[PDB]
Scaffold this active site. Structure first.
Site, PDB file in Angstrom:
ATOM      1  N   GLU A 174      45.635   3.773  22.650  1.00 34.32           N
ATOM      2  CA  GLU A 174      46.926   3.094  22.606  1.00 34.32           C
ATOM      3  C   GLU A 174      47.357   2.910  24.057  1.00 34.32           C
ATOM      4  OE1 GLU A 174      51.007   3.817  22.728  1.00 34.32           O
ATOM      5  OE2 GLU A 174      50.083   1.904  23.283  1.00 34.32           O
ATOM      6  N   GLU A 216      52.287   0.240  33.065  1.00 33.89           N
ATOM      7  CA  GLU A 216      51.618   1.531  33.200  1.00 33.89           C
ATOM      8  C   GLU A 216      50.145   1.380  33.585  1.00 33.89           C
ATOM      9  OE1 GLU A 216      52.253   4.223  29.899  1.00 33.89           O
ATOM     10  OE2 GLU A 216      54.129   3.216  29.362  1.00 33.89           O
ATOM     11  N   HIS A 261      59.344   0.060  19.812  1.00 31.27           N
ATOM     12  CA  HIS A 261      59.818   0.614  21.075  1.00 31.27           C
ATOM     13  C   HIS A 261      59.302  -0.156  22.283  1.00 31.27           C
ATOM     14  CE1 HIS A 261      61.197   4.814  19.569  1.00 31.27           C
ATOM     15  NE2 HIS A 261      62.241   4.098  19.949  1.00 31.27           N
ATOM     16  N   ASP A 288      57.760   5.615  15.933  1.00 32.20           N
ATOM     17  CA  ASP A 288      57.605   4.172  15.770  1.00 32.20           C
ATOM     18  C   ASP A 288      56.593   3.939  14.655  1.00 32.20           C
ATOM     19  OD1 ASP A 288      56.836   1.375  16.094  1.00 32.20           O
ATOM     20  OD2 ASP A 288      57.831   1.458  18.046  1.00 32.20           O
TER      21      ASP A 288
HETATM   22  N1  X9L Z   1      43.486   7.785  33.208  1.00 27.69           N
HETATM   23  C1  X9L Z   1      43.905   8.537  32.040  1.00 27.69           C
HETATM   24  N2  X9L Z   1      43.114   9.478  31.540  1.00 27.69           N
HETATM   25  C2  X9L Z   1      43.485  10.173  30.473  1.00 27.69           C
HETATM   26  N3  X9L Z   1      44.645   9.951  29.882  1.00 27.69           N
HETATM   27  C3  X9L Z   1      45.514   9.003  30.335  1.00 27.69           C
HETATM   28  C4  X9L Z   1      45.166   8.270  31.431  1.00 27.69           C
HETATM   29  N4  X9L Z   1      46.197   7.412  31.665  1.00 27.69           N
HETATM   30  C5  X9L Z   1      47.147   7.619  30.739  1.00 27.69           C
HETATM   31  N5  X9L Z   1      46.738   8.593  29.923  1.00 27.69           N
HETATM   32  C6  X9L Z   1      47.458   9.112  28.785  1.00 27.69           C
HETATM   33  O1  X9L Z   1      47.535   8.196  27.879  1.00 27.69           O
HETATM   34  C7  X9L Z   1      48.986   8.127  27.468  1.00 27.69           C
HETATM   35  C8  X9L Z   1      49.617   7.005  28.049  1.00 27.69           C
HETATM   36  S1  X9L Z   1      49.296   5.501  27.079  1.00 27.69           S
HETATM   37  C9  X9L Z   1      50.688   5.208  25.948  1.00 27.69           C
HETATM   38  C10 X9L Z   1      51.142   3.756  26.090  1.00 27.69           C
HETATM   39  N6  X9L Z   1      52.286   3.494  25.235  1.00 27.69           N
HETATM   40  C11 X9L Z   1      53.495   3.477  26.041  1.00 27.69           C
HETATM   41  C12 X9L Z   1      54.642   2.830  25.269  1.00 27.69           C
HETATM   42  C13 X9L Z   1      55.578   2.064  25.942  1.00 27.69           C
HETATM   43  C14 X9L Z   1      56.621   1.474  25.245  1.00 27.69           C
HETATM   44  C15 X9L Z   1      56.725   1.654  23.875  1.00 27.69           C
HETATM   45  C16 X9L Z   1      55.788   2.421  23.200  1.00 27.69           C
HETATM   46 BR1  X9L Z   1      55.938   2.671  21.281  1.00 27.69          BR
HETATM   47  C17 X9L Z   1      54.744   3.012  23.898  1.00 27.69           C
HETATM   48  C18 X9L Z   1      49.591   9.443  28.067  1.00 27.69           C
HETATM   49  O2  X9L Z   1      49.215  10.616  27.181  1.00 27.69           O
HETATM   50  C19 X9L Z   1      49.006   9.524  29.157  1.00 27.69           C
HETATM   51  O3  X9L Z   1      49.082  10.907  29.696  1.00 27.69           O
END
Ligand code: X9L
Ligand code: X9L
Ligand code: X9L
Ligand code: X9L
Lengths: 336, 336, 336, 337
Positions: free
Chosen positions: A117, A126, A274, A25
């Site tokens: 992000e 999420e 996306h 993207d």
């Molecule tokens: N508590 C935590 N501690 C450490 N890391 C964490 C934690 N929570 C999450 N993560 C990591 O962050 C990342 C997720 S955020 C990406 C959000 N975009 C989504 C998206 C949706 C539609 C289109 C597009 Br284009 C992108 C992943 O790597 C995940 O494993």
């Protein structure tokens, strides 16, 4: 129910193919690199925390802009791949991958700036903005956050084709002799289940019947708990007469740097991402005239499946014509 | 009531504009003239009874064919106009207009041939066929009837746009807050009322999913009472897979003369008439595969509104998927 | 009269008719505005709803706070009205009474009578008489919604509309239509076409003088006042040209304690399903700008729930005159 | 990982949309109705157990065939909806809906016949055949199973475009400056990740290079534990010369009734179903001549995520050239485009 969906979530983000899909993207990646590089003074010799770094791309952008040390926290197995990239790019003295959840790991040091992000569908899916806000415990008193603010835009829309698609799918359960079986008793239930699904895709802006209402989350001030219950009042001034089939949602995020404010917009007037856009359909549309006001509340309750229960109450004030709707952002219909 | 429906019917037929609209149908008028004139020996020096002559056009065709005496019976006020045309066409010695119902008038003489235009929508609307058969009390033993026979053709069809149109109309009564009022409790009734309406218009033959089933009425042999209850069984061999949204109906009539048999067809493979074609929709469409059999019964029960209550029961024999429908031939949807 | 009344109530038994009337936003919206913005006339009051149909006006009265509303309906639609009262949980405040307002029994005098009794030219279908009859249940301080009705007449010029009648009637002016001389009926055809009021809309530019207003005060008028309505007119022509007939529209006023609300069907207002009505002269009248066109329109109640219309007009300065008779029960719906 | 996996599984099957998607598959629903109705003698006045009844369509079919009593067992929330239909079709005297897993619920009576639709991708995905076989503890000694048998078909295929797709996709990482970042070091990992995904889609039968090898499971004879480790030997008599890129998989099931045997097939020579077909790529292609033999094993190991790990070893006997792959069926790549 929280632990199981959390396990599935991090397993989903452990895959390189997802990293590739998100990095491909160009609006996302390029806007983030522009926001970081054009605000290089916010990173020169600074301490950075990258929350949910994934493959580490934002940390590499921070290093490009001159950061002295970047703590890149990642809870999925992707952390290991990030470390590989840190070594092969010879940035071991500047990027420190910290595996684990940002709510549980220890950082040796407070940071000047947090980057992440964390946006999902409707900006809130999420529930990672809660982790982003939680990471502020590591933020120096007057530190910065990239992104800095987030605007959710809501606007009523008319789309008879989408409404009829979902209505016909639901009407499958209106059949009284499907292979000699009366399904009709479940029709209502089917309709409910089908209209709880937000529709994720893009659309022409001419389906929008009013100027969008903006709801703003200031990440410099928002607390994590604030995202458990989000109440968004709205009052639209209708510009076109016709049927309101529901509400359309999109979002922008602003990186408010010391050189430049950079906007990442997923608006339908901007190039497609996306994230697309999200549309919550009313089970029955509301007629309105141009000049009327459509007023009500969108209430988002964070649920234990890292998503939200959406409740949209909306009425045409002139006629008192009301609509109450419930939706689940964890079962979206990827229409595109 | 029967008396009031008859009053409205004959008042409707008293208008010259209706005569013009029917006569400007060149298929109807031209086919009738062809049948009469090409079988002129069935009229030369014969006695003719014209049942429901209206403006008298068929009586004039019979006179052109050489009929010695033509009794033109008409119950509406149009009878007066017919007499005018008889006098202005100098046929007072051959055409005798008799005002009143053919069931009540007295003719002075048995007739060699009965001619009439008794066909309504689906050939059975207005129940005029009954009057036509009644006129056989004046028919000589060697007598003939124009038309001689009538074929009703049924055929399953797929038309998703038509089904969606009627369903969308009925969906008005699903609104929970129309000006703050809950109409949904009537939606079922609404749907019923909309799908009891026969749809009168034309269509491409590509919507037909099987070869037509033909039901024949022999006007020479049939008795009046036969038309009080008409049962049409059918067993279609499905030629295409898809959704059967209902059954399409058209009709032919054959003037079986001595010289020649002349056909008047309202089939969709033929030039359009003011009869068009008539489609009966199912509230729930039936999925069928090619090679399946769609079997059932169309039952016409004569009611006191000069029309028929129609029951259509159909089923895909392979799956037992069944559809029962009612249609009021006194409330047609003219789709043009 | 009975044969027309039964067909009238059968016509009004269909939910499609109720839907078509309710979907007219001018009608439903203006009634709701008039009732709600005069809530002091309804709060805790006794209301009679004459010809409630589906009951929408009674629901508006309940929304304004009425203690008891008697909703009287003669067609089978009353049944559906009952279903709506139960489903909206208003049985303790709304009582549906099936039957004609002239025959049913009300257990109580009412504070206010509401109704939608307007037909084409405001008087067609004669339901205003029933409305006035309902005053036998009105208290001495009672009110009527609508309170007054204005019928507007104005001379118009439409050369093409006049031309259409002869173009249509000239079908009969053929000496050999399939060998038949039809010409003797041409005159009758012409007369038949001119006796039809033309229901459609038009550009206000075709109006040649300011309208003349005839007012019925429903609070003061008696039932028999509507059997014979004489409307004198003296138009002062604002334009020079031929006058082909008179154009009719109407407004009604709800004169409540708080404010007066108007419902207008004028050609300067948004189109309603009442459209506008035009009665042609058999021969047009030439008028100079500044001349006066004087005459009388006489509406005589007939046995078909409509009126015979007698129009006599003359240009005073020249003596040119025209006299025309129309039957409002067979209008020509020209709108396409 | 059974806990998260199974809660996600049953939540997935709690939706009416999934039930409708399975019901609208005319091959599935139509074949089941045909097998039950045309074998009415197997159901008339019989005791029936319906395993994982969903909305209960198979129980309604059994009722159409005259079954005396039908126990319909459903573990998801769909049981509630099933109950509704049983009440709305006036069959509460004949159909008893039991909410819960067939391993945990208590059926009061031994049944004459068991009916179910436990088939997943490659016939074995979602591991519900184990529940289907476990249900035989409620089966009378002379009882029957509908479906009765299940054949898994393997066949070598050639698809150059499909094989090259993996490297085209993984080559996104083979960039020395992606926004200034050298992504190259991950390219290999990307490749591996793509090759562990079975490809769920359909294809033209002309890509098949040999007659299928068939592995049969007889549900009347098989035990539940027979499905924990499934070793499918194969030796293919190559009918065409070319590069073999992997193995294609489909399945049939047979309802063997007293009157008739009815077949439900998901083969690529049959109309498409929602089972599609499944293709597992070799790590590297093997050249084979027509008349050569391609021998080896497909070993399915049931794992804790209600799926199978697929170990495939193959070799062209006439040359000794060999290849293998290890795939995770829980994470297939839905390629149908
Ligand atoms: N508590 C935590 N501690 C450490 N890391 C964490 C934690 N929570 C999450 N993560 C990591 O962050 C990342 C997720 S955020 C990406 C959000 N975009 C989504 C998206 C949706 C539609 C289109 C597009 Br284009 C992108 C992943 O790597 C995940 O494993
Ligand atoms: N008992 C009676 N005795 C004497 N006359 C009677 C009697 N009943 C009726 N009539 C007269 O016969 C005539 C009606 S039949 C025309 C049926 N085609 C309709 C039609 C429908 C769609 C397209 C087209 Br194209 C034409 C009328 O003149 C009527 O007044
Ligand atoms: N004596 C009675 N007692 C009880 N009810 C009665 C009685 N007479 C009549 N009704 C009921 O009132 C209703 C008719 S009035 C609708 C008048 N607008 C027409 C109209 C024309 C053009 C455009 C638009 Br937009 C609307 C029907 O429901 C009828 O059954
Ligand atoms: N231990 C249990 N006890 C009771 N019931 C259980 C148990 N395990 C599961 N179930 C229920 O059986 C049902 C399985 S879905 C039909 C499997 N075909 C999938 C499919 C895949 C591709 C294409 C198509 Br076409 C269909 C679900 O309702 C599920 O809840």
């Amino acid at each position: 129910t929280e632990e199981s969906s959390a396990v599935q979530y991090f397993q989903f983000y452990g895959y390189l193919s997802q990293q590739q899909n998100m990095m491909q993207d160009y609006v996302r990646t390029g806007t983030y690199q522009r926001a970081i590089l054009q605000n290089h003074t916010d990173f020169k010799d600074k301490i950075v925390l990258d929350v949910g770094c994934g493959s580490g791309i934002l940390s590499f952008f921070a290093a490009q802009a001159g950061a002295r040390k970047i703590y890149a926290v990642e809870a999925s197995t992707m952390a290991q791949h990030a470390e590989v990239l840190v070594k092969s790019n010879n940035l071991t003295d500047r990027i420190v991958v910290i595996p684990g959840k940002v709510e549980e790991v220890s950082l040796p040091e407070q940071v000047d700036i947090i980057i992440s992000e964390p946006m999902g569908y409707m900006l809130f899916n999420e529930r990672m903005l809660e982790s982003y806000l939680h990471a502020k415990k590591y933020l120096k008193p007057s530190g910065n956050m990239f992104p800095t603010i987030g605007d959710v835009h809501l606007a009523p829309f008319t789309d008879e084709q989408l409404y009829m698609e979902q209505f016909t799918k639901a009407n499958f359960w209106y059949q009284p002799s499907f292979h000699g079986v009366d399904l009709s008793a479940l029709r209502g239930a089917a309709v409910d289940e089908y209209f709880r699904q937000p529709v994720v895709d893009t659309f022409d802006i001419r389906i929008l019947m009013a100027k969008s209402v903006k709801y703003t989350v200031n990440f410099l001030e928002a607390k994590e708990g604030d995202l458990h219950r989000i109440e968004i009042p709205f009052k639209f001034h209708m510009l076109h007469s016709g049927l309101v089939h529901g509400l359309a949602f999109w979002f922008d995020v602003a990186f408010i740097g010391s050189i430049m404010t950079v906007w990442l917009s997923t608006a339908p007037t901007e190039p497609l991402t996306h994230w697309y856009q999200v549309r919550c359909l009313f089970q029955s549309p509301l007629f309105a005239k141009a000049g009327d006001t459509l007023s009500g509340t969108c209430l988002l309750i964070a649920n234990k499946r890292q998503s939200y229960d959406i409740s949209i109450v909306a009425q045409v004030d002139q006629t008192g014509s009301k609509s109450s709707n419930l939706l689940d952002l964890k079962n979206p219909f990827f229409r595109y």
